[PDB]
Ligand binder design. Structure first.
Ligand SMILES: CCCCCCCCCCCCCCCCCC(=O)OC[C@H](CO[C@@H]1O[C@H](CO[C@H]2O[C@H](CO)[C@H](O)[C@H](O)[C@H]2O)[C@H](O)[C@H](O)[C@H]1O)OC(=O)CCCCCCCCCCCCCCCCC
Ligand code: CLA
Ligand code: CLA
Ligand code: CLA
Ligand code: CLA
Ligand code: CLA
Ligand code: CLA
Ligand code: CLA
Ligand SMILES: CCCCCCCCCCCCCCCCCC(=O)OC[C@H](CO[C@@H]1O[C@H](CO)[C@H](O)[C@H](O)[C@H]1O)OC(=O)CCCCCCCCCCCCCCCCC
Ligand SMILES: CC1=C(/C=C/C(C)=C/C=CC(/C)=C/C=C/C=C(C)\C=C\C=C(C)\C=C\C2=C(C)CCCC2(C)C)C(C)(C)CCC1
Ligand code: SF4
Ligand code: SF4
Ligand code: SF4
Lengths: 159, 93, 31, 143, 80, 743, 154
């Protein structure tokens, strides 16, 4: 019994099969993330990603920021998180504009792990990526607003 | 491809070169229609490349300008200004 | 109204951001 | 004039346990190379990318991502094991291109069916100075 | 693609051909020396610019010269 | 199968024929010199036995004889030490009053005004103060007069002669055969038991009879010349009975298993001796006794001739699991046919061991009057640290040499090595990520503190008074160590070391020997810096070893060899792709890491440990505890450490320490000189040498041996050698001057 | 005097430095026994310092405001002992060395393997050649005049 195997049994592709790389639970978890929901509208996946990330970013800015001790710690940190979300939206938009064209199909792989055809993920198109990045921006702003509202605006004892 | 030990065929180059998606779902939307019907309707105006880029750039610029030009004294010590008398140099001043 | 307060962010944050975005778009795409 | 051998899929590939030095996206979108040999007996050889692999009995086919890798593998097969080899260039369109040995005889041995390319009929010290080829698209050695 | 040139001082020793690590050089029939051989460079598009051929040439100055030129993915030796 | 003695008679006849021919080993070298490059090559491959030939037997015989020669050199060095201590030293004056006199065992003749270096070291003596710590060793051994030192020097000279003769005899008269060298089971059995265990038993026996009674008399206050000679304590046993009553019964407790009766001189106290400031000698004797038992038992593991024992092949091949295939199968054949594999393993282990030796030796000082000899402590720590670092880098060098030369899967195949070579890309990528992450968070915090301090925002700094980064784990571990005696280790009275805690400061002669070392935010930051540097140097060395044979850039890198300049400017440029160049870079990074480690040790010791005790018990530390608050910024390291402590060395002119200032400046010069070689290429130098050679040709004074510029690899080697010499020597001068003037 | 300096013999800072040096040396002497080896060494060093300063004053060196001797190399005949006659001595010795080495190189240049006699010095020939450097000033002069010092055709 050996645990590590070559990719799909093909030993000449630069990768391996390992419990970390390909275990049942890990594979399921990775496939169930918005980035890998190929058959879903890119806008909704972007919404989910943006919500998660915007809510994430508020904490470090608020607690570790230069105005953490000041009474306006929540406001300052939330504004910083929103600004970072805006900059990330700028980065996404320029990446999509530079890396995609309207008249080209999706650059995503068209084959699955068993060798059967499937519609390439539309996220890697021009308008698909535009929808995904718009959804990400909206979700990020919403997540920052929610995290800011959850604290400070409402007490809610934490820590 | 994959007959026994063969790992090459011109008929299917995509499989031969390992052009798979290790984690693509190929599953239907986990969201119910109602939630998507709201998100796709309220987040619609932000899904244009040029429009979104221009709006983001100018809106962020105006927001930064407004927030920096109207900062309160407890925010930035730079603009609150000095609060002590100035010292003299060794001979200048 | 403090003229430096308006311009320092404008030239240190807005201007580099827009310039880098524009130049990345120009340098990084087929014409 | 030496019909180049046609690449034959279904030929077994060498026994290998997998590696992180294999193909990448360049093979998927640009090109990759395939080398074939015979190897009279099953034996273990050093891969050009990772550890050790075993050549199967009879024909063997190996796909590499670089032509230089194919040449190194062919050199080892030719000098260590005394095996005859040929490798191809495969494009994503499905094209195959016989590469080496181009005319059935290795490039080391002179063949009466080769024309000269990039041969200058003068010593290297008789090239014009750059000033004579300035503002013309040519280079002093291209003349 | 780098530019490889063979000059008429070549003595057809074949040492450059043995050295090329991408099969760029060849031996072709010729009549100006005892070996009736001279080097050729018909596949310079696969040249990586290693200049390993020049290190093997016994003539002085060299009979094979490699001039590095425009770089391609083949000339840069990139596997990705 | 059996273990026996195998040799060959008169393999090489001693003669002078090959002396007259420079470079007999290589045929082309034997032919003669064509260019000056030849000369350098002759030295670059002097000890590369495996390249001059391919027979394992000849390589093994040469290695054995060279070992004998080096052992002879070491013995000569030790004999010189003992002779200098005997004649040109103030050892007896120091013995009468240790804390009062500064040890010295070197005088300089008065020739060009250099006699200023013969400084006032005390004890009616003028010489150069020595930081090697030999006086403490001799005191701990029981040496009281110079007759004993003279006898030891003569004996060491005789043993050096014996080692030299043994080397000659074994290479030229009786050379062991290959099967003799390949017998590793008996070798391990003898070294574990015959050498280490038996040697430790012998040293314990000496300590029981000579060290203990002599040091007890010395600590009782008896003048050294009035003490009975070490042999008397053996003739008349009541001499020992007086100091320790349990010697009265004599051996019968040992044979009736009434070993408790030996508790008088075989103790488990721990801590330091309050009088001398070192470990209890009754603890060291027991230490060596227990070590002797353990090694004499461990040296009975491997089977040699009588069936009982372990076959190393069986042990290796019995280990293998689902994640490693058939791992450990074939390693025995690899490690008994390649010398470079063994050399790399042993070099790594010896380097780590030397580093551990430094750590443990300043942790709990083992020699009397060593803790308060601050110069000795600092010098010993720094010396052992550098030696260990160099040995570790050599480990990587020789692992790469083996990989290029002796690794062969067709005949000697190993599974673990194959799997490592197959996922080297993942290994190196993750190591690279770890290096980047550590570099950002360790050094980035320093830059953050510096920027905050410059902007007048000390409240935002990562300090003990602003944002604390307390090493909770280290604090917990040392707290558990402090509580250890009487709780988890009942038989010990004092903790292992006084750095753990528990208070009980120990001082000698008005100077602090040791006291608890506190760990704070600065310690956290410097420890993470250490981790970062070690990881980066490991990255360089491991990448050099793993990618020695091939890579995605040059798929046939092994065919070029272990040492070579490049593979041309193709593929964008293939400069420094060989494993030797990876060792060359690892040298720079090892220098960086060890320099930071020794700087941390020196500053922490001066700030929080070393110092002077007073009547009320108020400790005044050499540096008034500024490490905790000043070491958290780069400006503090530049100001409160380098600038502040360089005053001692730069001022040394006009005194006995002027040599240290001279060496300071000279080391700076040599280091800056190295950059000449590290930054340039040999093409420019060859072109310049062309014009020089023409100028010589114009006067009929051109050399016949054509003067070529140095090879590329030689340029790199010269650059790194000069860089290391200059840096290490300037640090050496700085440390020695600072600690001798302030200590 | 020259360059505004004054003779060391009548200079004052020179004498002050001399006194300070001797005082510094004597400070260490009083610590040891009057007639021990360290005391004898320190006394010898003090005597050496006194002799050095007296000799510097005797030879007529120039001392600046710093109180240290300064060397005049303009060519003034009052100071030829500072740079010019030592310079002539150096030129003689260095030409000796260079001429001897060149003679050796020219002598061994005729063998089939001259490099062998370069990494292994042919001492027998070298001992005969080294003495030509006594008269190299004449040999080189006539070598130049005769026109074979410099390799023609180059
Ligand atoms: C006070 C007032 C009076 C002053 C008078 C001063 C006189 C000069 C000083 C001393 C004279 C006595 C010297 C000792 C006597 C033997 C010297 C001699 O004949 O020894 C014999 C040699 C031979 O001289 C010449 O030597 C030349 C080089 O030959 C040989 O040179 C070498 C000699 O060992 C080697 O053999 C070498 O292979 C070979 O080239 C020539 O070619 C001839 O062989 C030969 O004429 O003289 C040598 O120079 C030997 C080296 C020492 C010469 C010293 C000259 C002074 C400086
Ligand atoms: C060159 C121009 C420039 C300018 C004008 C600023 C200005 C500022 N910096 Mg920055 N910085 C710069 C360069 C600059 N920085 C560079 C080159 C570096 C790299 C070394 C940094 C590294 C740095 C760090 C690590 C931090 C700052 C912080 C800050 C803020 C501290 C004062 C404060 O508390 O205000 C008010 C505090 C707030 C939290 C309000 C946030 C600012 C506005 C309201 C956000 C709105 C953004 C808006 C949507 C536009 C997006 C950008 C768009 C123009 C593209 C301040 C607004 C600190 C900070 O505040 O964290 C964010 C801080 O942690 N700077
Ligand atoms: C090359 C000359 C020069 C230089 C080195 C600077 C440097 C500086 N200026 Mg200034 N400025 C200049 C010319 C210059 N200025 C001119 C000609 C004017 C109009 C009279 C101004 C008006 C001005 C104002 C109102 C302010 C500054 C301020 C500042 C400081 C902060 C950064 C900033 O606000 O950006 C500069 C802001 C501008 C509005 C500049 C616009 C004017 C020129 C024509 C722009 C040049 C752009 C051009 C494409 C690049 C020039 C070539 C090369 C240098 C790249 C900074 C030290 C701020 C300050 O006071 O510091 C606290 C501030 O508020 N400047
Ligand atoms: C005492 C007389 C003697 C004589 C006449 C010879 C003669 C010979 N030996 Mg030998 N040998 C001797 C003693 C002797 N050996 C001893 C005592 C040892 C034990 C170390 C050896 C071990 C030995 C080995 C392993 C080998 C020889 C070899 C040889 C032959 C090759 C040339 C040679 O010697 O190397 C050159 C002569 C030298 C003097 C080189 C210097 C070596 C010394 C040890 C350096 C000293 C280190 C120094 C302290 C370093 C610090 C530098 C500092 C001073 C700046 C030659 C016929 C070689 C051979 O036979 O090739 C097949 C061979 O491999 N010998
Ligand atoms: C790596 C070194 C380092 C570190 C740790 C810090 C840390 C800090 N700096 Mg700082 N700084 C640094 C270097 C560093 N700096 C350098 C080199 C400079 C230039 C000289 C500055 C200049 C600077 C300024 C001017 C200021 C700071 C400030 C701060 C504080 C707030 C910054 C902030 O909120 O940003 C944003 C933080 C985040 C966006 C968090 C991202 C990182 C997350 C938490 C980790 C993600 C990994 C995650 C665990 C992975 C798990 C994956 C899993 C979930 C799947 C903070 C404690 C501000 C301050 O007020 O100090 C108190 C301030 O104004 N810094
Ligand atoms: C009691 C048995 C014994 C002892 C004590 C030693 C001791 C030693 N061996 Mg050794 N060895 C042994 C058995 C033993 N060996 C056997 C049975 C074999 C065959 C398998 C080997 C094969 C072997 C090799 C191949 C090498 C050693 C080496 C060494 C030295 C290692 C360096 C060191 O630590 O220096 C410690 C220094 C001292 C302890 C100083 C005192 C030295 C005394 C005089 C050694 C005498 C022991 C010797 C075995 C006596 C037999 C010879 C007799 C006819 C006179 C060391 C002195 C290495 C070496 O050459 O040394 C540099 C080495 O290359 N040994
Ligand atoms: C017991 C330890 C040990 C042993 C037995 C060896 C043995 C060997 N090593 Mg090795 N090595 C070691 C440790 C060791 N090494 C360590 C610790 C390092 C890291 C620094 C290295 C790094 C290393 C490299 C990079 C290489 C070797 C090589 C070799 C082989 C040939 C060495 C040679 O003769 O070249 C000639 C030796 C010299 C010219 C001597 C160098 C003189 C040094 C630089 C001067 C030292 C200056 C001094 C300390 C202070 C100044 C004094 C001065 C002012 C007078 C040989 C088998 C070479 C090889 O090819 O392997 C097969 C090679 O490439 N080693
Ligand atoms: C968890 C860490 C730890 C460590 C590092 C030690 C270390 C030590 N203990 Mg200790 N001990 C511990 C936990 C620990 N102990 C705990 C949790 C308890 C219960 C509270 C004890 C109770 C204990 C007693 C009663 C004694 C020691 C003793 C000792 C010392 C001799 C060890 C020995 O007998 O050889 C090894 C003995 C063996 C039988 C080999 C088996 C190894 C283990 C079981 C696996 C040694 C320094 C002895 C001492 O007094 O030291 C002088 C002793 O009398 N320990
Ligand atoms: C006092 C310091 C100065 C000393 C000057 C020494 C005399 C220099 C002039 C004579 C130089 C000389 O004759 O050689 C002149 C040397 C060559 O020397 C000439 O060589 C010729 C060919 O062999 C002839 O033999 C001539 O006789 C010979 O003088 O060439 C030059 O230096 C060029 C100067 C012009 C001629
Ligand atoms: C007087 C004086 C001075 C000055 C001077 C001058 C400035 C002049 C000059 C000069 C010059 C202007 C010189 C020149 C030269 C030139 C040439 C051209 C040469 C040559 C030579 C040679 C070439 C040689 C060779 C040799 C020899 C002889 C030696 C050995 C061998 C040999 C071979 C190496 C002063 C004031 C400072 C000071 C005082 C003194
Ligand atoms: S430079 Fe290298 S790859 Fe190019 S022709 Fe010469 S040997 Fe071949
Ligand atoms: S190495 Fe030089 S001389 Fe020999 S065949 Fe090639 S070009 Fe001609
Ligand atoms: S610069 Fe030197 S090391 Fe780099 S490719 Fe050129 S010859 Fe090789």
């Amino acid at each position: 019994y050996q645990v590590v195997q070559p990719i799909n049994g093909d030993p000449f592709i630069g990768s391996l099969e390992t419990p970390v790389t390909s275990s049942p639970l890990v594979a399921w978890y990775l496939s169930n993330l918005p980035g890998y929901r190929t058959a879903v509208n890119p806008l909704l996946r972007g919404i989910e990603v943006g919500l998660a990330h915007g809510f994430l970013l508020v904490g470090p800015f608020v607690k570790a920021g230069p105005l953490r001790n000041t009474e306006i710690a929540g406001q300052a940190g939330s504004l910083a998180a929103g600004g970072l979300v805006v900059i990330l939206s700028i980065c996404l938009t320029i990446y999509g504009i530079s890396s995609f064209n309207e008249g080209d199909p999706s650059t995503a792989p068209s084959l699955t792990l068993t060798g059967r055809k499937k519609q390439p993920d539309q996220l890697q198109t021009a308008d698909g990526w535009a929808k995904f990045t718009g959804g990400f921006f909206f979700g990020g702003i919403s997540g920052v607003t929610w995290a800011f509202f959850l604290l400070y605006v409402l007490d809610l004892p934490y820590f | 491809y994959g007959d026994k030990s063969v790992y090459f065929d011109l008929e299917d180059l995509g499989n031969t070169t390992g052009q798979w998606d290790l984690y693509g779902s190929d599953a239907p939307s986990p969201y119910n229609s109602l939630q998507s019907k709201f998100f796709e309707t309220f987040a619609a105006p932000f899904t244009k490349r040029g429009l979104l880029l221009k709006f983001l750039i100018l809106g962020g610029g105006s927001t930064l300008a407004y927030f920096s030009a109207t900062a309160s004294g407890d925010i930035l010590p730079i603009k609150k200004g000095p609060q002590l008398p100035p010292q003299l140099g060794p001979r200048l001043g | 109204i403090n003229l430096p307060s308006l311009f320092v962010p404008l030239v240190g944050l807005l201007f580099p951001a827009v310039a880098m975005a524009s130049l990345f778009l120009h340098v990084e795409k087929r014409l | 004039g030496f019909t180049p051998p046609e690449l034959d899929p279904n030929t077994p590939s060498p026994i290998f346990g997998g590696s992180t030095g294999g193909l990448l996206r360049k093979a998927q979108v640009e090109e990759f190379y395939v080398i074939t040999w015979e190897s009279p007996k099953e034996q273990i050889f050093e891969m050009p990318t990772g550890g050790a692999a075993i050549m199967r009995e009879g024909p063997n086919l190996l796909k590499l991502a670089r032509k230089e890798q194919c040449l190194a593998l062919g050199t080892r097969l030719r000098s260590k094991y005394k095996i005859k080899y040929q490798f191809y260039r495969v494009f994503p369109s499905g094209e195959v291109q016989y590469l080496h040995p181009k005319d059935g005889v290795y490039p080391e041995k002179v063949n009466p069916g080769r024309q000269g390319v990039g041969v200058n009929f003068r010593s290297i010290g008789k090239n014009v100075s750059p000033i004579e080829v300035k503002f013309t698209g040519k280079q002093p050695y291209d003349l | 693609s780098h530019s490889v040139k063979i000059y008429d001082t070549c003595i057809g020793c074949t040492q450059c051909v043995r050295a090329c690590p991408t099969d760029v050089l060849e031996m072709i029939p010729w009549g100006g020396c005892k070996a009736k051989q001279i080097a050729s460079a018909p596949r310079t598009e696969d040249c990586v610019g290693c200049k390993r051929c020049e290190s093997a040439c016994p003539t002085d100055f060299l009979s094979v010269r490699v001039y590095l030129w425009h770089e391609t993915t083949r000339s840069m030796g990139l596997a990705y | 199968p059996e273990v026996k003695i195998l040799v060959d008679r008169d393999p090489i006849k001693t003669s002078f024929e090959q002396w007259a021919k420079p470079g007999h080993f290589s045929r082309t070298i034997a032919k003669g010199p064509d260019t000056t490059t030849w000369i350098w090559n002759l030295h670059a491959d002097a000890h590369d036995f495996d390249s001059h030939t391919s027979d394992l037997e000849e390589i093994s015989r040469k290695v054995f004889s060279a070992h004998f020669g080096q052992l002879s050199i070491i013995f000569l060095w030790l004999s010189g030490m003992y002779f200098h201590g005997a004649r040109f030293s103030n050892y007896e004056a120091w013995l009468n009053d240790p804390t009062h006199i500064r040890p010295s065992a070197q005088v300089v003749w008065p020739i060009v005004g250099q006699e200023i270096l013969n400084g006032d070291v005390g004890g009616g003596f003028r010489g150069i103060q020595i930081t090697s710590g030999f006086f403490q060793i001799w005191r701990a051994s029981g040496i009281t007069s110079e007759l004993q030192l003279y006898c030891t020097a003569i004996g060491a000279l005789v043993f050096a002669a014996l080692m030299l003769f043994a080397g000659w005899f074994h290479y030229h008269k009786a050379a062991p055969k290959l099967v003799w060298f390949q017998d590793v089971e008996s070798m391990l059995n003898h070294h574990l038991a015959g050498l280490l265990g038996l040697g430790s038993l012998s040293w314990a026996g000496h300590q029981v009879h000579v060290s203990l009674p002599i040091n007890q008399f010395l600590n009782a206050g008896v003048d050294p010349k009035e003490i009975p000679l070490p042999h008397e304590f053996i003739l008349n046993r009541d001499l020992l009975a007086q100091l320790y009553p349990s010697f009265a019964e004599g051996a019968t407790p040992f044979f009736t298993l009434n070993w408790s009766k030996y508790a008088d001189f075989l103790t488990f106290r721990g801590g330091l001796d309050p009088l001398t400031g070192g470990l209890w000698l009754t603890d060291i004797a027991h230490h060596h006794l227990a070590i002797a038992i353990l090694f004499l038992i461990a040296g009975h593991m491997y089977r040699t001739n009588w069936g009982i024992g372990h076959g190393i092949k069986d042990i290796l091949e019995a280990h293998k699991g689902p994640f490693t295939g058939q791992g450990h199968k074939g390693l025995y054949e690899i490690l008994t046919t390649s010398w470079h594999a063994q050399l790399s393993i042993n070099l790594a282990m010896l380097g780590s061991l030397t580093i551990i030796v430094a750590h443990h030796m300043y942790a709990m000082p083992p020699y009397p009057y060593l803790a308060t000899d601050y110069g000795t402590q600092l010098s010993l720590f720094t010396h052992h640290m550098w030696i260990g670092g160099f040995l570790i880098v050599g480990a990587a060098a020789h692992a790469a040499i083996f990989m290029v030369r002796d690794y062969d899967p067709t005949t000697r195949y190993n599974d673990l090595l194959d799997r490592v070579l197959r996922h080297r890309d993942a290994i190196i990528s993750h190591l690279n990520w770890v290096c980047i992450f550590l570099g950002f968070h360790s050094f980035g915090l320093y830059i953050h503190n510096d920027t905050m301090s410059a902007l007048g925002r000390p409240q935002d700094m990562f300090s003990d008074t602003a944002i604390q980064l307390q090493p909770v784990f280290a604090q917990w571990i040392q707290n558990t160590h402090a509580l250890a005696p009487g709780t988890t280790a009942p038989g010990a009275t004092t903790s292992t070391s006084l750095t753990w805690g528990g208070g009980d400061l120990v001082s000698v002669g008005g100077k602090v020997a040791l006291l608890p070392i506190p760990l704070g935010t600065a310690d956290f930051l410097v420890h993470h810096i250490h981790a970062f540097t070690i990881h980066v140097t490991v990255l360089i060395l491991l990448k050099g070893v793993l990618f020695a044979r091939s890579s995605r850039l040059i798929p046939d890198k092994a065919n070029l060899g272990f040492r070579f300049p490049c593979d041309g400017p193709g593929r964008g440029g293939t400069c420094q792709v060989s494993a030797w160049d990876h060792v060359f870079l690892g040298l720079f990074w090892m220098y960086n890491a060890i320099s930071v480690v020794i700087f941390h040790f020196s500053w922490k010791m001066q700030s929080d440990v070393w110092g002077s005790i007073n009547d009320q018990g108020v400790v005044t530390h050499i540096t008034g505890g500024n490490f905790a608050q000043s070491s958290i910024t780069i400006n503090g390291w530049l100001r409160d450490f380098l600038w502040a402590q360089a005053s001692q060395v730069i001022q040394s002119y006009g005194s006995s320490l002027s040599a240290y200032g001279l060496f300071f400046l000279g080391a700076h010069f040599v280091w800056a000189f190295s950059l000449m070689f590290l930054f340039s290429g040999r093409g420019y130098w060859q072109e310049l040498i062309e014009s020089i050679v023409w100028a010589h040709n114009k006067l009929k004074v051109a050399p016949a041996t054509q003067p070529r510029a140095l090879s590329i690899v030689q340029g790199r080697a010269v650059g790194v050698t000069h860089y290391l010499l200059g840096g290490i020597a300037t640090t050496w001068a700085f440390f020695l001057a600072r600690i001798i003037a302030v200590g | 005097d020259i360059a505004g300096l004054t003779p060391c013999k009548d200079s004052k800072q020179f004498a002050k430095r001399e006194k300070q040096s001797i005082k510094k040396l004597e400070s260490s002497l009083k610590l040891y026994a009057p007639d021990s080896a360290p005391a004898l060494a320190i006394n010898a060093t003090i005597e050496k310092t006194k002799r050095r300063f007296d000799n510097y004053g005797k030879q007529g060196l120039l001392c600046g405001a710093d109180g240290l001797p300064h060397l005049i190399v303009s060519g003034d005949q009052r100071h030829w002992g500072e740079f010019i006659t030592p310079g002539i001595l150096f030129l003689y010795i260095a030409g000796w060395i260079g001429w001897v080495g060149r003679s050796y190189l020219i002598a061994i240049r005729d063998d089939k393997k001259p490099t062998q006699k370069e990494i292994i010095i042919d001492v027998p020939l070298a001992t005969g050649l080294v003495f030509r450097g006594f008269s190299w000033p004449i040999a080189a002069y006539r070598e130049l005049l005769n026109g074979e010092l410099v390799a023609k055709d180059v």
